Amino acid sequence: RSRKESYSIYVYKVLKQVHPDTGISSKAMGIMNSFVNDIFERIAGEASRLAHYNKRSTITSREIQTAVRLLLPGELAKHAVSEGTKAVTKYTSA
Amino acid sequence: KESYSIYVYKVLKQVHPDTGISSKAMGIMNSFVNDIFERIAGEASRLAHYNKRSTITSREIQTAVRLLLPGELAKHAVSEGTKAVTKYTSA
Amino acid sequence: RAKAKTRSSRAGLQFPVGRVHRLLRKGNYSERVGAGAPVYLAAVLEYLTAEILELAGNAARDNKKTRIIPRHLQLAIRNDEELNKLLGRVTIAQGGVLPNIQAVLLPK
Amino acid sequence: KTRSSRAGLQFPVGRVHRLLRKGNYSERVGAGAPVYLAAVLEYLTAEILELAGNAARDNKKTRIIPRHLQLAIRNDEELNKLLGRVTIAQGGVLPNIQAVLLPK
Amino acid sequence: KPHRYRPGTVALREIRRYQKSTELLIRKLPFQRLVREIAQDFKTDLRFQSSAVMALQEASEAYLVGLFEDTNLCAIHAKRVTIMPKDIQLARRIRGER
Amino acid sequence: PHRYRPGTVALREIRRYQKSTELLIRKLPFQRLVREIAQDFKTDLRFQSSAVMALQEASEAYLVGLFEDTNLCAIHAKRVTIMPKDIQLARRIRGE
Amino acid sequence: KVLRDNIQGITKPAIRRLARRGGVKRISGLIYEETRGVLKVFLENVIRDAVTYTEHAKRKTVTAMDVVYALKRQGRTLYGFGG
Amino acid sequence: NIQGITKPAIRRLARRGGVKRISGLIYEETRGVLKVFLENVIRDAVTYTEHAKRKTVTAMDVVYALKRQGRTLYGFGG
DNA sequence: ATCAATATCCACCTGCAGATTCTACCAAAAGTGTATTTGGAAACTGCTCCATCAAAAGGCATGTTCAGCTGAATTCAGCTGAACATGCCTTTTGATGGAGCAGTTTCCAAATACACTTTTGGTAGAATCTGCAGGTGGATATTGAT
DNA sequence: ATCAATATCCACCTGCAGATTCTACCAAAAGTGTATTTGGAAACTGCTCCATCAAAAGGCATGTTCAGCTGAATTCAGCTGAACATGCCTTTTGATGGAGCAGTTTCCAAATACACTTTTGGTAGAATCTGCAGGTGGATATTGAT
Ligand SMILES: [Cl-]
Ligand SMILES: [Cl-]
Ligand SMILES: [Cl-]
Ligand SMILES: [Cl-]
Ligand SMILES: [Mn+2]
Ligand SMILES: [Mn+2]
Ligand SMILES: [Mn+2]
C-alpha cells in the first residue's frame, strides 16, 4: 500500500551500462542498496562535520569532495573526485 | 570560546571538597564531557530519524544512554536523568 | 512554462540528483545544501556502484553465470585491495569467504 | 532561576540545549532532553572524579592529574569499557607485568 | 584392506568445500530457538520478522568464521595445527573483545 | 666487577616506565619526522606546538598498546622475546 | 513451551563446519563449549540493542532493521537486509 | 629521519608495554609501523587543514584525524 | 637457602616557580513573558506476515571404535641480545626578530529556501521471460598403498 | 612407478521460481517567483610560529663479554579424525487464525518565535598558596660465593 523507495532501478541502469547482458539476483540487489545507503551516510556525515568544524551552515560540493578524500582509499578517491567534478561543471553549464 | 571547566570544578568540590585538579587534567575532563555529549546526541539523533520523528525528547536521550553505556553505568545514568527531569518539571 | 529536464540528465548522471538532495535535506546534516552538493554526491555513489558491478560482473562470468549473486559481490570486493579497505568492516550476506588455506596446513 | 538550578544540577542545561539545537541533530529539541542529558553528563563526571580522587589520595597526592584519571578509568571495568578506544594524554598505563616474565 | 583416509586429509577437503560455498552452516530452527530464548530474556512476548532472524544468523556466522580465521593464526603462531581455547582467547583479547 | 643478570635491568625498566607518563621518544627527532611526512602532502605547512604534541601522545600510546599485544603473541608462542612475526600477528588480528 | 538450553543446539558438527570455512584443520575438544560461550555473548550483545530499538519504536516485533542498526552500532555493518 | 627514532627510545616504549626481551629486527619493524601510522594520521589532519584554507596544522585537526580513525585522544581541545 | 658487598630505589624534606585564587569588567548567553503553530500521541482499522502445527521424507546428529600423528615434555648447543664502559654528540631550553597567518567586521551580489502548480520519473503489481537449481552420469584427480 | 578406491569436476537437460519487462496511477521533482541567508572581497591588527644561534647536559653509539633463550632433535601417551549404524528432528510445504504493523484523522501539549532584561562564564592582571624539580641517605634487592 505504501510506496517503498530504493536505489534499485539506478543500480540496474548502471549494471546494463557496464555489463549489458548480465543480470542481478534480488539478494544481490539488496546488497547493492545497502552499499549505496552506507556510502551516502558516510560521506554525508563527514561533510556535516566539516561544515560544523568550519562554522559553515551549508554543505557544498566542496565539503562533499573533502569527505570523499577523507573516506575513500587511494585511486578510488581520485576517480570519484574526477567524476564528481565533471558532473558538477557539466550541470552548471546546463 | 567555551569549556566545561567551572562545572567540572563544581562537581569536584562536591565529591572531594579538599582535592584539586591540574590544568592538563581539566583538559582531559573537558574532552571527556564533549566526547560523551556527542556520542549520546548522535545516537539520539539517529533514533529520532529511524522512527521518523523530528524532535529529540528525553525519551531519545534515555534510549541512547541505554545503547551507549555499560550495565550499571546505564542504570544509574537513567536514574540521574529521570530524577532531574522530574525535579525540573515541577519547578 | 519551460519543459522540465531533470537535474540528473543535466549532470549526465544515472543516479537521482533530486532524491539525493531531498535525502541530504531530511537527514539533519546541515541547515542548507548547496546546489552542487547533491550532484557531486550522486556522481560519486554512481561511480562506486559502477566499480563494484564491473568487478562482480567479471566474477559472475568466470563461474559461468549470467546473473550476479552475493558471492560474486564478495569475490569482487575482497579480491580488490581498495574495495576491501573501504568495506573492511562490512559483512556481505551470503558472501562466503575467499578460498584460502595456510601453507603449513597442506600435506608434505 | 537557571534551568540548571530548577533541575538540581551543576552542569549547564541552557548550554546543553543550545549545543543540541546547533549541532544539526534534529529539527526540534524537547524541554526535557537537555536536562536529562546534562544530568547524565554530570553523573558520569562525578563517577570519574570520585574514582580519580580516590586514586590520588592513595598515592598520597592532593591534586588530580591525568595519571589519576587513567588509573581511575583503567581500573574500573565499566569506565574502561566506555572509554576503551580513548587515549588519555600523559595518562601512562596500568602497572602490569606478565607472570611468566618474573624471576623464580 | 578397507579404505581409510589419513587424519587431516578429509579435514582439508572440508576446508575447500565450505570455503567454496556460502550457505549457512548452523541448522536454522535451532538457531531461531536460540535467538528467541535470548530475546525473551530481555523482554517477553516478542515476535521476530523472519528476515530479522536470518540477519542475526548471517551476522553470527560471519563473526564466528572471522574469529576462527584469527584463532587459526594464533594456533599456527604457536607452531600448532590444532586450535585450542587459549587461541580464541588470544584472538578476542587482541581484538579488544575481552 | 659487579654485573646484573640478563633480564634484571629489563624488569627494573618495565617497572620504571609503567610508573611514569613522560613521552619516551625525543621531541625534536619526532618533530622532524612529523614535518618530513607532512611535506610530501603539502610543502608550506606550519604546525601548532600542541599539534605536534598531540601527534606524539597519539603515536606513543599507539606503539605502547601495540607492544602489549605483541608481547602477548610472543608469550603465546612460549617465548619471552618479541620478534617481527609477533608484531605482524598482532597487527593482522587488529585489522591493520 | 519454555525455551531452555538452546545454546546446546548449536552442535559440534555445525561448529566444525564454521571452523572449516575459517580454514581450520584440527580442533581441540574444548573448542565446542568455548565457541558456544563466545556466540552467546555475541548474540546477547546484538539482540539486547536490537530489542532496545524495538522498544523505543514501541513495537512488539523485532525487525531486520532493528538488527541492522544494532549491528551497525557495534561496528559490524551488515548488507543485504534493508529492503 | 625515521632513523632519528632510536633503538633506546623504541626499547623504552616496549618497556612501558611490558616487554622484557627484544629481538634485533624489532627496531626496523617498529620504525616502519610508526611511519605508516603517522602517514595515515597526518594525511587526514592536513586534509582538514586544507579544507579550512589554513596553512597551519592545529591540534584540533590532529584530534579530528585521529577520531576518523577510531582513535579518540583526550586533552587537546577544543 | 645464608652472608657481604653493591647498586639502585624511594621516602622524606622544603623553598620557590609557577599554578591557583582574587579582583574586576562585560558581551553574549541564558532567562522571561507572551503569542502562535504544530509534531505526534491517541484511536482506530485493514491487511500483512508471524506463530504454530503437522506429516513425511531422509538428512544429518550422535555415539562408538581405534590408531595416526599431534602436543607436550625434555635435553642440549650455538648464537643472539642484555649489561656495561666509554666518550663523543644530539637534544633542550632559553631568547630573539619579524612576517605572514588567522580571526574580526562590514557589506552587497549571489546563492539557497520554500509555497504553489505542472509534469513525469518511480513504484506496485501484472504479464512475460528464462537462468539455473537439482538431479543426473561420466571423466578426471587424488590418495594411500601392500 | 601401478592399482583400487573415492571424491571431485564439470557438462548436460529443462520446468518453474525468480528475475525482467510492461502499465498505469500518482508522489515528488521541476519550474517559478520571491524572501532570506551567506559566504567573501576588502581592510584591518596582534598573536603565533619559523629561522637561527649557542651552552651543556644528559643521552646515544659503540664494542666486548657471556648468560641464557631460542630452536632443533627426540620420544611417547593419548586425543582427535575417520568411518560406521542408528534413528532423531530438522526441513518442506502447506494451511490457518489472528497479532499487531502500518496507514489515517483529529487535535492539544509542547514546541518555536520574538522582544526585552538579567545573569554569568570567559578573560586577564595581580596577589597569594602550595605541589614538585631535585637532592639527598637510608632502605631494599640483587649477586656471587659458600
Ligand atoms: Cl554546492
Ligand atoms: Cl523532552
Ligand atoms: Cl587452551
Ligand atoms: Cl620474525
Ligand atoms: Mn528465558
Ligand atoms: Mn499535524
Ligand atoms: Mn562569574
Short mmCIF file of N, CA, C and O in Angstrom, two decimals, chain F residues 45-85:
data_model
loop_
_atom_site.label_atom_id
_atom_site.label_comp_id
_atom_site.label_asym_id
_atom_site.label_seq_id
_atom_site.Cartn_x
_atom_site.Cartn_y
_atom_site.Cartn_z
N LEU F 45 53.48 23.80 5.06
CA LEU F 45 52.67 23.64 6.26
C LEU F 45 53.37 24.18 7.47
O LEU F 45 54.55 24.00 7.63
N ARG F 46 52.61 24.83 8.34
CA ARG F 46 53.04 25.15 9.69
C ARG F 46 52.37 24.21 10.72
O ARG F 46 51.34 23.60 10.42
N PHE F 47 52.93 24.14 11.92
CA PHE F 47 52.35 23.33 12.98
C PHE F 47 52.24 24.12 14.27
O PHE F 47 53.21 24.73 14.71
N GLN F 48 51.08 24.07 14.90
CA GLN F 48 50.98 24.48 16.29
C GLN F 48 51.81 23.51 17.13
O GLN F 48 51.90 22.32 16.79
N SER F 49 52.46 24.01 18.17
CA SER F 49 53.23 23.12 19.04
C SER F 49 52.30 22.09 19.66
O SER F 49 52.66 20.93 19.76
N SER F 50 51.08 22.47 20.01
CA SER F 50 50.24 21.48 20.63
C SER F 50 49.83 20.42 19.60
O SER F 50 49.49 19.31 19.96
N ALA F 51 49.91 20.74 18.31
CA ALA F 51 49.58 19.77 17.28
C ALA F 51 50.65 18.70 17.10
O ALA F 51 50.34 17.52 16.89
N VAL F 52 51.92 19.11 17.19
CA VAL F 52 52.98 18.12 17.19
C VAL F 52 52.88 17.27 18.44
O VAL F 52 53.17 16.06 18.42
N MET F 53 52.51 17.89 19.55
CA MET F 53 52.40 17.16 20.80
C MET F 53 51.23 16.15 20.81
O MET F 53 51.36 15.07 21.42
N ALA F 54 50.11 16.51 20.18
CA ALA F 54 49.01 15.56 20.02
C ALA F 54 49.48 14.36 19.20
O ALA F 54 49.20 13.21 19.57
N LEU F 55 50.22 14.61 18.13
CA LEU F 55 50.74 13.50 17.33
C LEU F 55 51.68 12.59 18.14
O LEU F 55 51.73 11.38 17.92
N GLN F 56 52.45 13.18 19.05
CA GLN F 56 53.40 12.40 19.80
C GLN F 56 52.66 11.56 20.86
O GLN F 56 52.98 10.40 21.05
N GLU F 57 51.75 12.19 21.58
CA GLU F 57 50.91 11.48 22.53
C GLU F 57 50.21 10.31 21.85
O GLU F 57 50.24 9.18 22.36
N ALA F 58 49.62 10.58 20.69
CA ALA F 58 48.87 9.59 19.94
C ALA F 58 49.78 8.47 19.44
O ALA F 58 49.40 7.30 19.51
N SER F 59 50.97 8.81 18.94
CA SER F 59 51.92 7.84 18.41
C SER F 59 52.48 6.93 19.52
O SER F 59 52.66 5.72 19.32
N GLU F 60 52.85 7.54 20.64
CA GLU F 60 53.42 6.74 21.68
C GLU F 60 52.38 5.79 22.24
O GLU F 60 52.69 4.61 22.40
N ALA F 61 51.15 6.27 22.45
CA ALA F 61 50.12 5.42 23.02
C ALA F 61 49.84 4.28 22.06
O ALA F 61 49.69 3.13 22.47
N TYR F 62 49.78 4.58 20.77
CA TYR F 62 49.64 3.53 19.78
C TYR F 62 50.75 2.45 19.87
O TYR F 62 50.47 1.26 19.95
N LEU F 63 52.00 2.88 19.90
CA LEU F 63 53.11 1.90 19.94
C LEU F 63 53.17 1.11 21.25
O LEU F 63 53.43 -0.08 21.23
N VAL F 64 52.91 1.76 22.37
CA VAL F 64 52.88 1.06 23.66
C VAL F 64 51.78 -0.02 23.64
O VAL F 64 52.00 -1.16 24.05
N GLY F 65 50.60 0.35 23.13
CA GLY F 65 49.48 -0.58 23.05
C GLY F 65 49.80 -1.75 22.14
O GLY F 65 49.48 -2.91 22.43
N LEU F 66 50.48 -1.46 21.03
CA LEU F 66 50.89 -2.49 20.10
C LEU F 66 51.92 -3.45 20.71
O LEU F 66 51.86 -4.66 20.47
N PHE F 67 52.88 -2.91 21.46
CA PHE F 67 53.86 -3.72 22.17
C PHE F 67 53.19 -4.65 23.21
O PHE F 67 53.59 -5.80 23.33
N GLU F 68 52.17 -4.18 23.92
CA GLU F 68 51.39 -5.05 24.82
C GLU F 68 50.87 -6.26 24.04
O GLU F 68 51.06 -7.38 24.47
N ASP F 69 50.26 -6.05 22.88
CA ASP F 69 49.68 -7.14 22.10
C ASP F 69 50.78 -8.05 21.54
O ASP F 69 50.65 -9.27 21.44
N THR F 70 51.86 -7.41 21.17
CA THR F 70 53.00 -8.11 20.63
C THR F 70 53.57 -9.01 21.69
O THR F 70 53.91 -10.15 21.45
N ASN F 71 53.68 -8.46 22.89
CA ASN F 71 54.20 -9.25 23.99
C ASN F 71 53.33 -10.47 24.29
O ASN F 71 53.84 -11.54 24.57
N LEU F 72 52.01 -10.32 24.21
CA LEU F 72 51.08 -11.45 24.37
C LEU F 72 51.27 -12.50 23.27
O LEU F 72 51.14 -13.71 23.50
N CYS F 73 51.55 -12.05 22.05
CA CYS F 73 51.80 -13.02 20.99
C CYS F 73 53.10 -13.81 21.23
O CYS F 73 53.18 -15.03 20.98
N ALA F 74 54.11 -13.14 21.76
CA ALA F 74 55.38 -13.81 22.00
C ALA F 74 55.19 -14.88 23.07
O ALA F 74 55.60 -16.02 22.92
N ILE F 75 54.47 -14.51 24.11
CA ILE F 75 54.22 -15.38 25.25
C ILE F 75 53.40 -16.59 24.87
O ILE F 75 53.67 -17.70 25.31
N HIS F 76 52.47 -16.35 23.97
CA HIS F 76 51.64 -17.39 23.42
C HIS F 76 52.50 -18.46 22.73
O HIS F 76 52.18 -19.65 22.75
N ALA F 77 53.56 -18.01 22.08
CA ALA F 77 54.47 -18.94 21.43
C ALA F 77 55.55 -19.45 22.41
O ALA F 77 56.58 -19.92 21.98
N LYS F 78 55.33 -19.27 23.71
CA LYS F 78 56.22 -19.74 24.77
C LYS F 78 57.57 -19.12 24.64
O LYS F 78 58.59 -19.77 24.84
N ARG F 79 57.57 -17.87 24.22
CA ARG F 79 58.80 -17.11 24.11
C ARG F 79 58.70 -15.98 25.10
O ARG F 79 57.60 -15.69 25.61
N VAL F 80 59.83 -15.35 25.37
CA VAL F 80 59.84 -14.19 26.24
C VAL F 80 60.39 -13.01 25.44
O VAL F 80 60.47 -11.89 25.90
N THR F 81 60.74 -13.28 24.18
CA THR F 81 61.37 -12.30 23.28
C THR F 81 60.43 -11.86 22.17
O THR F 81 60.02 -12.72 21.39
N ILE F 82 60.13 -10.57 22.02
CA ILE F 82 59.27 -10.18 20.89
C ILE F 82 60.07 -10.11 19.60
O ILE F 82 61.25 -9.69 19.59
N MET F 83 59.43 -10.57 18.53
CA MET F 83 60.01 -10.68 17.20
C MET F 83 59.06 -10.04 16.19
O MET F 83 57.87 -9.82 16.49
N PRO F 84 59.58 -9.70 15.01
CA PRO F 84 58.72 -9.09 13.99
C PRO F 84 57.48 -9.93 13.72
O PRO F 84 56.43 -9.36 13.49
N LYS F 85 57.60 -11.25 13.76
CA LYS F 85 56.43 -12.10 13.50
C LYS F 85 55.33 -11.84 14.55
O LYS F 85 54.16 -12.02 14.26
#
